[PDB]
Subunit: 120 residues, 5 copies
């Protein structure tokens, strides 16, 4: 069991994207946020964010951004691994969410995406 990989939404698509610069607390940050759909439906949790200088995992901001962007471009089916209730900037969470983006993997069927699932 990988820590932080037990909260995911599978077979979703990235259909919105935000990227910006922002001062939060006392730090100048960059952030991006993905908006999620599942076909014509909107998943329960639909907005996941990553911030360069805040979070449980500060590494990989540029790589995650490029990855998100590619998937937004193709619109393909992906699994999004995320972490709930991370951001405490109430201004930020009101506008986007408290969710922190952890990983994105691809799917090869309505039923299977790459990466760990809750056993079983």
């Amino acid at each position: 069991n990988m820590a932080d990989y037990n909260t995911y939404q599978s077979n979703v698509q990235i259909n919105n994207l935000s990227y910006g610069v922002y001062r939060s607390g006392d730090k100048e940050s960059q952030f991006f946020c993905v908006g999620l759909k599942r076909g014509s439906q909107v998943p329960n949790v639909h907005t996941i964010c990553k911030i360069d200088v805040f979070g449980t995992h500060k590494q990989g901001f540029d790589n995650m951004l490029a990855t998100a962007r590619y998937y937004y471009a193709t619109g393909e089916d992906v699994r999004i691994y995320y972490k709930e209730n991370v951001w405490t900037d109430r201004n930020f969470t009101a506008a986007f969410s408290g969710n922190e983006l952890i990983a994105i993997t691809t799917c090869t069927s309505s039923d299977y995406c790459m990466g760990p699932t809750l056993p079983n």
Copy 2:
């Protein structure tokens, strides 16, 4: 609300892009500007720039550039958050604008774009 996110234009397209290097004050800078339209119309503020070593927020130059270029390439509907009357180099502002680029988010209808609204 999010500081610096109260000034924006929704459902615009990035129909022109400028990138260049330039000496301003006594500092060597990089800059890019987006030119905007809303359909056949030109909005109030239509030129918005970001500069690597100047501005209210200096971070994110490369990621903001890569992002603007993506949207220039697709011609898709976006919202642009910016900050007014930032640049003090009067040669620059005359040629482009005094507007600093803060964020770019995507839009799915004339109603909804991602990010905070007022």
Copy 3:
């Protein structure tokens, strides 16, 4: 022969890609993994990973990611060089594998891929 180039699969395709951030041991890491098919079949070794701050070769993370993603986009025949039984984090291996990604070369025919062979 070249150290670490004795183990490979030729003429497979990358049909899935994983990228994420993860704490392993005491380190904050990035990883990505390619998932492999050979046509419609799954090959013996089907999952190969690279991690920025762990491995036989920590260099080239961004360039290896960029390369994988490229071949994922095209779906072309590649030959993949890898090192088995590298990762010792048993939560990682169970979720992906213990194979470390060493190199990716291209293929012009079902008979030839670039790079050393045994």
Copy 4:
């Protein structure tokens, strides 16, 4: 007017591209050059270059290259701002030119390219 923005070619296309590594003096450098055309014509200035550790603006090498490469790909109309008589290495300028690349902007018509112009 912006200092280095008086010299430009409008509504051209980048139809050739060079990139390489080169020792000039005792300084190891990278350079890239754009080759220009105007539809079927070739403008007065047809070769323009940027070098990572030489020139009037050493910054923005990676971004300028990515920008030029993109425009090379789409082959679209751009405006090119440059600086003449920069490069002192006579081997380099005989091989390419003495022109330094300052900026690249896009054009939405034959009448308009983004960026300043003269009177």
Copy 5:
């Protein structure tokens, strides 16, 4: 002439690409190699490599790689400038080559590629 720019092959296509990590001479390195064709033929020197921590010019590894990947993608006509027999790790040379990548420029036709040429 430009030092290191007198050895080249014009109007070739990059038809193969290798990228990997590797330990040589007790240093941890990245390398990539382009493989070349000329139409239905294979030029005299068909494999040219660049290595991040070794070579006559160690700069520009990411930019050269990105450049070579682009031309692998398009399969278009290019001129490759290289330097011969630089690599001394015989494992590597037997597997790939001993040639170091110096520059890549684009061609408009079989008469003209960008960059310095011999008379």
